Structures are given as structure tokens and as C-alpha cells.
């Protein structure tokens, strides 16, 4: 045990200068805080990532089905992104955004770059030429699947897609290492993420598990996020947040959940308290208060990262 622990402190640390920060970690260990990250709009999500949001400078990799909601926090972390006064890149292959949800979300639509590109290479470059300029904080990639080849668009053997995205990230990794800013790949439940899987800091798996009520009508979806791969803290980390139609990610809902969570809301049945404080009966109520009383659910906010250190 002692004479070990040095032999195995020592292995640790030459893994750690040999192939970079994070390249070995005990599942236990807190996280390296890093100065800034792109919070997700999910306190859950955010907690579940370890360092408080997405990592600047990396490969981020959202997958999940179709309408899971992996789009919707690609867009929170769009909108976090510009409410920070960062600019926010969108090449879109899929033609699915809608901006009017962007835009309930938080996300400054007017000012989001855009680009629907003829090709998977023309696609890449573009996000390419653009994360060189070193003015973007963060680009969403919609998505994986579509970045199709322009051989195969123009009717021309089957694999270079494979290819292309491998040739890409190499090239497009070291780019945003130096300019710092986020590059978040969308991709659905395919080809092409094969590379993605490996150049990827963080690899969440967006899931929805069951539809909210309101009364006997669809509201929204309670989600689920895994952090399958995560080099900036601890993976495999799982967060659950609601997603509301219309609005988005319930950031109160969030508050709440993890208040509960970390002993800082207690309970008295369907009574949540807070302080001493009631906030609501029940969870509608309470997360009601919280958006019609912005002061206490950043107070919320504050508390619960400083209980973690977020």
C-alpha cells in the first residue's frame, strides 16, 4: 500500500504528461475546474459534466434518436454562449432549425452565424476557416449523418465519408484547441462518428423517458442525459431535466431537482421548502415561484454550486 501508491502515483502522472490531462482518473476524484465552460441549462447536466458546462477548445459529440432533445441543449449551449457576448456558429445539413424556439430558448437568432453548405467538405471547411478566425466561442454541427461527400453527391468507392471526417477532425481539433472555441457535433442513433468517438472530449447520449403531463395533454419530455465519455472529469455520469415544448429546458425544474438532491430544498410531503421558506406545493408550483422569483432560484443556484464547486 505505501511503497504502491508512490509506483502508482508515478505511473498516473507519466500517463498524465505522456498523453495530456485526463487520460487516466478514478471515478471518485472531483474535477479540475476549469475558468470557463458553456453551461447547458440543465444545474443536472452541468453537475453531470463535472466542470460546470461544456469544455472550451474541444470536440463535443451530442447523439441520441430522433426529437430527443440533443438539439435543444446544443441550442442552450448556443444561447449561454452569446449571453456570455461570445458569437455562435450553426452549419446546418439537416435544414431542420427552428428559430422561433431558438429564440424562446435565449438564443440570439439575429446574430447567429449560418451556413447550409453543398457538401459534408465544403461543410467542414467552413467551420474549418471559421474556428481559425478565432472570433467564435462555440459551432454547432447539424448533423453527422448529413455531411454527405460531394463524390457521392455528384454520382461517383463507399467509405470515404469515414474518411473525410477523420481528415477533418485531425486538421479541425487542433484549430479549436488553439482558438478555444466548442464544437459541438450533432449526430443521431450515425456513420462518420467513428472518428468523432475518439477526437471527442465529451460524448453525451441524449434520451427521452417519459412524457410530462399537463393534466391529460403533452407538455413536454423528461430527458435523460449520459456522459459516456467525459476527459475533463469523471464519465458516465447521468443527469434528467425536463424539456417543455415551446420553451426548452426547465432551468428551475433543475434548480429544484438538484436542491432536493443536495439537502439544500427539504421537503414536507408535497410542500417543497427552502430557508425555512415554502417554494410551492408540488413541483409545478415550486418551479413556478422559482421563474416568477428570479432572485431566490439564482440564490438556489449560487448555493448549490458552491456546495459541489461548480
Excluded at 43 to 51: E, K, Q, T
Excluded at 174 to 199: E, M, P, R
Excluded at 245 to 259: A, F, V
Amino acid at each position: 500500500t505505501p511503497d504502491r501508491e508512490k509506483a502508482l502515483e508515478l505511473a498516473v502522472a507519466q500517463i498524465e504528461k505522456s498523453y495530456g490531462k485526463g487520460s487516466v482518473m478514478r471515478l471518485g476524484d472531483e474535477a479540475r475546474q476549469p475558468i470557463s465552460v458553456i453551461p447547458t441549462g440543465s444545474i443536472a447536466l452541468d453537475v453531470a459534466l463535472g466542470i460546470g458546462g461544456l469544455p472550451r477548445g474541444r470536440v463535443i459529440e451530442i447523439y441520441g434518436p430522433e426529437s430527443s432533445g440533443k438539439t435543444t441543449v446544443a441550442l442552450h449551449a448556443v444561447a449561454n454562449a452569446q449571453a456570455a457576448g461570445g458569437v455562435a456558429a450553426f452549419i446546418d445539413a439537416e435544414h431542420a432549425l427552428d428559430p422561433d424556439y431558438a429564440k424562446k430558448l435565449g438564443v440570439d437568432t439575429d446574430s447567429l452565424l449560418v451556413s447550409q453548405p453543398d457538401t459534408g467538405e465544403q461543410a467542414l471547411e467552413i467551420a474549418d476557416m471559421l474556428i481559425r478566425s478565432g472570433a467564435l466561442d462555440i459551432v454547432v454541427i447539424d448533423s453527422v449523418a448529413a455531411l454527405v461527400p460531394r463524390a457521392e453527391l455528384e454520382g461517383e468507392h463507399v467509405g470515404l465519408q469515414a474518411r473525410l471526417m477523420s481528415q477533418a477532425l485531425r486538421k479541425m481539433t487542433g484549430a479549436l484547441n488553439n482558438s478555444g472555441t466548442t464544437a459541438i457535433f450533432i449526430n443521431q442513433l450515425t456513420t462518420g462518428g467513428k472518428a468523432l468517438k475518439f477526437y471527442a472530449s465529451v460524448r453525451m447520449d441524449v434520451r427521452r423517458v417519459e412524457t410530462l403531463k399537463d393534466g391529460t395533454n403533452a407538455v413536454g419530455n423528461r430527458t435523460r442525459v449520459k456522459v459516456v465519455k467525459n476527459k475533463c472529469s469523471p464519465p458516465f455520469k447521468q443527469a434528467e431535466f425536463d424539456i417543455l415544448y415551446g420553451k426548452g429546458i426547465s432551468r428551475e425544474g433543475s434548480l429544484i431537482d438538484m436542491g432536493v438532491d443536495q439537502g439544500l430544498i427539504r421537503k414536507s410531503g408535497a410542500w417543497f421548502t427552502y430557508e425555512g421558506e415554502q417554494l410551492g406545493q408540488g413541483k409545478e408550483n415550486a418551479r413556478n415561484f422559482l421563474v416568477e422569483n428570479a432572485d431566490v432560484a439564482d440564490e438556489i443556484e449560487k448555493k448549490i454550486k458552491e456546495k459541489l464547486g461548480i
